[PDB]
Amino acid sequence: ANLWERFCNWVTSTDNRLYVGWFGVIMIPTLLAATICFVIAFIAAPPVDIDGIREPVSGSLLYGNNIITGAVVPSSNAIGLHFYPIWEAASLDEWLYNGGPYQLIIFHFLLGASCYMGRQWELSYRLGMRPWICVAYSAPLASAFAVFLIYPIGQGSFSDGMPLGISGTFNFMIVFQAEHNILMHPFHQLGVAGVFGGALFCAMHGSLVTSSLIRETTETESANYGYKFGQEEETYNIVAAHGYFGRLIFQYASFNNSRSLHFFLAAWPVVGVWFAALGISTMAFNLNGFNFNHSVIDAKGNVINTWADIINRANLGMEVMHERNAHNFPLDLA
Amino acid sequence: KLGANVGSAQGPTGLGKYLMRSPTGEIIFGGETMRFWDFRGPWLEPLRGPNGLDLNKIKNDIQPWQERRAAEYMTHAPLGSLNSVGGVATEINSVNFVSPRSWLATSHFVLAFFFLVGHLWHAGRARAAAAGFEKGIDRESEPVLSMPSLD
Amino acid sequence: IFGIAFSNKRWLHFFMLFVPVTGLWMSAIGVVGLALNLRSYDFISQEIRAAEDPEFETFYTKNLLLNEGIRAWMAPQDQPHENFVFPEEVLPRGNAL
Amino acid sequence: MEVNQLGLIATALFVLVPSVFLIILYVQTESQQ
């Protein structure tokens, strides 16, 4: 057993309290870099010229932000998609002014999280598990990629990536609605069915399983003690739950197969969020939501407004007010 | 054409309204399009000198075919709705247009994504199948049971 | 993978009941507030600072500018009974757009 | 920043009172055989 072999054995060891693994070898330093930079920046970073018009936006706590308004601000529009590592700046002060921390953080993060996915596959393989938990995780991951990378690529600037902050997130959403009418995009709608449905089925599954717990406890103790970790027998009666839910709707709308049921629980929100992510990623190339603006016209040619047109009015408010100083020409083409 | 000195026109932000410098000094178009200064195209390059957009070429050498081209391309930006209403999302119905570039880019992003998913799926499955546990854990041989507790 | 894990199945499925149910109940409470316009609209400290200091900008003030746009541009058509006539000159707009 | 100064104590109590509650419950649970 030589040193490289020993190292490999420790890296891929199923005995480490937290699994490292080969993906972990990339994941750990990149996530640590992103995390440290993010915390420091969120607290103390000076204002950033996000839109490149020498109009710095304050994102850190020390500069007048609270938890809700604070953000790591996206790098400057003057940079566009240019790579802006620290060593491309003449000073740290420059780097900070132009929003370098955003780039450091999101590149390290996206890397680390991709490696998180890989690591999920990897431990599944060391443990003799089936491999696809990582595929589930591909849905939020893709989403992160959509808002931190793909959308900037399509719009030509990281300054249009999602800010790392709560209110910043809301800003990105509102502006996104203004420029792509995302609500009227079926992939966002599928996304909504994905997460609404996911929540519904979460509560559904939780409640049916809980409703059919086999009595193992007295009224003065938590029912949870009726289950003991590693016990071979099931802790609830799936036949009772099926009888109940099947009568709730009708028999053939209830699962009687736990495998196919749990598979459904997995598939619905995962597919939905895949579609949401694809929505963001395709609106990144300006294939936008349905446009029915002035779609309904009377016999003379008068515009008959629909709810689509009201939505358009709101969208117009957003469009005309957003980045109020950054546009010189009449069309906002990116 | 209306008489503006585009070179010295200060925009509302203090940056030039028409022209400004890139972060490395090249003379570039201003406004939001500052982000797009890496763009090169046959209609724009004649206005380009060693330091970027050349102001004397701008003042004297812009040909009508360039104006035409710029107007055409500006009014055929790859923006449009899913039902092929061209323009920004707030544009009214009138112009039946979605750019081929959008069609192609979006289609192939979607395809590429799902093919990455398919790669994860089949690579993981292939590993599991080769090692012999793609159908599930052997009850009498459950690996984790032969491992020490984490704590 | 993650540091912690479920070990109790009953607790797991109860938790799956608990999370979305509680979330929906919370949103419900907020909307009951909005019935009275009892909003979480502003941060007063932010507004005092921004009123005094025209170089102070946050994503919070940015979003307020967006809200102001939404109101001004959608109100007349969205609330026809009010008969809002907003001349072009009073509409809030950034440069060019 | 002109924050509401009561925020401080409001936050402090918000954290301390329920947390302490839990801690009491936990410790006397451990001290049982």
């Binding site: - | - | 070990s7 | 100064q5 401080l8």
Partner: peptide, 30 residues
């Protein structure tokens, strides 16, 4: 004051992560 408060709460949460992970009740098979 607010900043100190925010960072304090945050720091407590990170400390809590540490304990919940490394000083957890061990899952014991029965």
């Amino acid at each position: 004051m607010e900043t100190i408060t925010y960072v304090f709460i945050f720091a407590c949460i990170i400390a809590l992560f540490f304990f919940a992970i490394f000083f957890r009740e061990p899952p014991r098979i029965t």
